[PDB]
């Protein structure tokens, strides 16, 4: 399935920027509030939705922030990657099991 | 990593779910054309977006494809999974200039 892994890929890159964004403004506001409120407007003008834009933007904005976001991202990427392979496949069989179940209750009894 | 990677799980899990749905649209406009129209208009009536809510939803309305649903993105994740971390990893290495640069002083 080239086409669903492809755009799969490109969802989870973009939803790890979000994580590694999230994770940099927790730090921000214990260490420079400054630029945790900076990161907060910058947000509300770039939707991080879009992560290729927003990071380019950001590289106009503020070089020394979006290095740490992609430093930060990398080191979430690798950490984090080659659990969700058997989290997610391990969930779904769960969830279809339990949704079978809820299923075959309702048609017989 | 723990939180990270169980609510990344989560979000992968719904967004296989919706491309299982995308699938199976397609499959309906082809074979039974009447019903992809019908999953249009659930569709717009039940966020995919809210997963459980719209699975719900489905077995109170449609059981055949819910069930349908079920073992495409089942079949998916099966499929797919194991290419993620590598697809991403190089993704992201690749498009962050500061990684070659990064081995490059490195190597020297
Ligand atoms: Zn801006
Ligand atoms: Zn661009
Ligand atoms: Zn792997
Ligand atoms: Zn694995
Ligand atoms: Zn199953
Ligand atoms: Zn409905
Ligand atoms: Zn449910
Ligand atoms: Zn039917
Ligand atoms: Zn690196």
Do not use: C
């Amino acid at each position: 399935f080239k086409k669903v892994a492809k755009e799969t890929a490109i969802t989870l890159q973009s939803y790890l920027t979000y994580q590694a964004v999230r994770l940099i403004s927790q730090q921000l506001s214990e260490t420079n509030p400054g630029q945790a409120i900076w990161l907060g407007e910058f947000s509300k003008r770039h939707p991080i939705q879009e992560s290729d834009l927003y990071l380019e933007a950001m590289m106009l904005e503020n070089k020394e922030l979006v290095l740490r976001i992609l430093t930060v991202r990398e080191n979430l990427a690798e950490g984090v990657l080659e659990f969700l392979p058997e989290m997610v496949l391990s969930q779904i069989k769960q969830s279809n099991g339990n949704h079978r179940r809820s299923l075959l209750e309702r048609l017989t009894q």
